[PDB]
Paper text:
In eukaryotes, mRNA recognition is mainly mediated by the cap binding protein eIF4E, which is responsible for binding to the capped 5′ end of the mRNA. eIF4E is part of the eIF4F initiation factor, a complex formed through the interaction between eIF4E and the large eIF4G subunit. The remaining four eIF4Es all bind to different eIF4G homologues (five are conserved in trypanosomatids), forming a minimum of five different eIF4F complexes. The EIF4E6/EIF4G5 complex has been linked with the stage-specific translation of mRNAs encoding the major Trypanosoma brucei virulence factors. As first described by Marcotrigiano and collaborators, a curved-shaped α/β structure forms the cap binding pocket on the concave surface of the protein, while eIF4G and 4E-interacting proteins bind to the convex side of eIF4E.
The structure of T. brucei EIF4E6 in complex with the TbEIF4G5_79-116 peptide (hereafter called TbEIF4E6-4G5) was determined by molecular replacement using the EIF4E6 model predicted by AlphaFold34 as the search model. The TbEIF4E6-4G5 structure was refined at 1.90 Å resolution to a final Rwork/Rfree of 0.1923/0.2219. The final model comprises residues 7 to 178 of TbEIF4E6 (out of 186), with the polypeptide chain clearly defined by the electron density. The exception is the region comprising residues 24–36, which could not be modelled. The electron density maps also clearly showed the TbEIF4G5_79-116 peptide, which could be entirely modelled (residues 79 to 116, plus two residues from the expression vector). In contrast, even though the TbEIF4E6-4G5 complex was incubated with the cap-4 analogue prior to crystallization, no electron density corresponding to cap-4 was observed during refinement of the structure, indicating that it did not bind to TbEIF4E6 under the conditions tested. The TbEIF4E6-4G5 complex shows an extensive interaction surface. The TbEIF4E6-4G5 association involves 10 hydrogen bonds and one salt bridge. The TbEIF4G5 canonical helix interacts mainly with TbEIF4E6 residues from helices α1 and α2 through both polar and hydrophobic contacts. The loop connecting the two TbEIF4G5_79-116 peptide helices, together with the lateral helix, also accounts for a large number of contacts with TbEIF4E6 residues from helix α1 and strands β1 and β2, including a hydrogen bond between tryptophan 114 located at the C-terminal region of the TbEIF4G5 lateral helix and the carbonyl group of alanine 56 from TbEIF4E6 α1.
Author numbering:
A (entry chain B): 79 to 118
B (entry chain A): 7 to 23, 37 to 178
Write the structure that this text describes.
Amino acid sequence: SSYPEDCVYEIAEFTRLQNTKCLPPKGILQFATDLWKESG
Amino acid sequence: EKPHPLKDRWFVSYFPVKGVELDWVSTAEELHATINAFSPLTLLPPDDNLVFAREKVEPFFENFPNGMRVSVFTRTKVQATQAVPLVLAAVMGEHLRTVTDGPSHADVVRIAHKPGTVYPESLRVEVWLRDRSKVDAVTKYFSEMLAPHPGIRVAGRPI
């Protein structure tokens, strides 16, 4: 909602994005998938 | 709906108990998605470090000759859920700049599951500061930001 021009975000505005539906970058996505497959 | 850009791009690596280079993150949404992919952080393999490095600085103590290490220790899953977003907001979100009067020099963030006998879900989140002169302001900031939760512990040690 707030997009400060200096990219210095308010804590509440930054933390509210933890529920994002965006996918992580492909290198992270593949590694994390493989890591949880090797646990169970 | 538009992404929230990070002031700097951060390179993500994974160091099992050298590292595995994963990918860049340049928005708050990609950074949170990265944390969600490695969650619950409390179930990660013990001692492995998930690392975020500002502009891909090599995350080794040799590159921080007169730096400081600020550590946040949590004991439970509820405490990790509170502390981790707060550290990311202070560092990647750049909120620490409200006390550092310009760049914080908080250039590396490391997260590890460090199980204890009494508290198996214990996490250790480290923030590496390149510049030692700001460690007093940074520590006070983390202590105040985490004072509502007396279970969370904050400590500073040199590099």
